[PDB]
Design a protein around this ligand. Structure first.
Ligand SMILES: [Zn+2]
Length: 115
């Protein structure tokens, strides 16, 4: 129940990774599209934690302009999807940005804070 009657984030999205201000409350459309966010951390780690699968989410604040964000970054296409990573903590993939829609910006709901 985060999207009020209209399909717009009623709360403000805050990079829960750096308590940064991602999007404002009312500047992002809703998007329950099954998206996939592969932990950009990757890195070596050696052995890993047996969990190379990103997160197949579905809710996403679909914005029509990345300029709306603030200190947000963008994870180059990791194979077939341009993910998004807050520039204050390049990690994500917190947002989803496929190449099919150069204007379909996504902000993984559960992958962000909301107050
Ligand atoms: Zn951040």
């Amino acid at each position: 129940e985060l999207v009020s009657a209209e399909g717009r984030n009623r709360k403000a999205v805050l990079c829960q990774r750096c308590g940064s201000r991602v999007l404002q409350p009312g500047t992002a459309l809703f998007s329950r599209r099954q998206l996939f966010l592969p932990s950009m951390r990757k890195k070596p780690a050696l052995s890993d934690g047996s969990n190379p699968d990103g997160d197949l989410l579905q809710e996403h604040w679909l914005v029509e302009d990345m300029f709306i964000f603030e200190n947000v970054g963008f994870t180059k296409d990791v194979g077939n999807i341009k993910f998004l990573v807050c520039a204050d903590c390049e990690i994500g993939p917190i947002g989803w940005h496929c190449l099919d829609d150069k204007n379909s910006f996504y902000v993984a709901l559960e992958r962000v804070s909301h107050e």
